[PDB]
């Protein structure tokens, strides 16, 4: 129900606003890596969207 | 001159049109 | 990272000149001349 | 241990970092067809090379 | 997963901040005496409004 | 509660300190042999002295 999301320490030099979502961790596909196993869901994904 | 107001796009303060001080809406005017 | 960060705003059009006033004179005429055909007005950082 | 009071994550939340195995551990699936192992699973410490 | 050592809380600890809801989900109760939902329950997701 | 996708420690570990309590709680024991209460145990809130 809550998540306490933290990051130190910055210069907020040119800071312009926040923008923050909620969606799947089932429809997430990982950029990260090339191939991307456990990603089943081919749905749209809004990360992506 | 009252710069230190308008939003400046750039070193150019946007000041606006000449339309954007008054009013004329009336019913078929 | 710097303590007053104007140079590296103003470098790049963060913070620094109009569209039009860094330019060389030049390319206002050239970029305004070819307005309707073969427009380049895009690539040039209006900041606000 | 033994929270029984339901508020969930008072802990500081970290990002999870871009790769396969830090979002779940399903049991996913390879490219052609054949499911791969999850992460819990011990299987996936080996490079399984047809 | 099946932790097995009870050493527990290794995990940095942020504070609880100031509203209802981030310090249990018990059976609540109203200003007058009925009983208000748990937090856990998705009750709680729409506006109650007699 | 109910985690059910088993990636686990999404939460920034901070460091164990140095002292014995936040390492395990299993059957310790004391150094002439018999055995001493774990952390878990609510034994070991008095200073038990022979």
């Given amino acids: 129900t809550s998540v306490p999301i933290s990051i130190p320490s910055r210069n907020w030099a040119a800071f312009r606003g926040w923008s923050f979502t909620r969606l799947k961790t089932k429809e997430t596909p990982s950029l990260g890596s090339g191939f991307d196993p456990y990603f089943t869901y081919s749905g749209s994904v809004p990360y992506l969207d | ?29 | ?48 | ?50």
């Fill in chain 4, 1 to 50: 241990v033994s929270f029984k009071g339901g508020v969930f994550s008072p802990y500081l939340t970290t990002r999870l970092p871009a790769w396969a195995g830090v979002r779940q551990n399903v049991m996913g699936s390879n490219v052609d067809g054949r499911p791969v192992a999850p992460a819990n699973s011990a299987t996936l410490t080996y490079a399984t090379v047809g």
């Fill in chain 3, 1 to 48: 990272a710097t303590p007053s960060m104007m140079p590296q705003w103003s470098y790049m059009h963060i913070a620094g000149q109009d569209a039009s006033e860094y330019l060389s004179p030049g390319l206002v005429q050239f970029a305004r001349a070819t307005d309707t055909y073969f427009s380049l007005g895009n690539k040039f950082r209006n900041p606000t």
């Fill in chain 2, 1 to 29: 001159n009252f710069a230190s107001l308008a939003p400046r796009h750039g070193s150019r303060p946007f000041m606006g049109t000449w339309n954007e001080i008054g009013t004329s809406q009336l019913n078929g005017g």
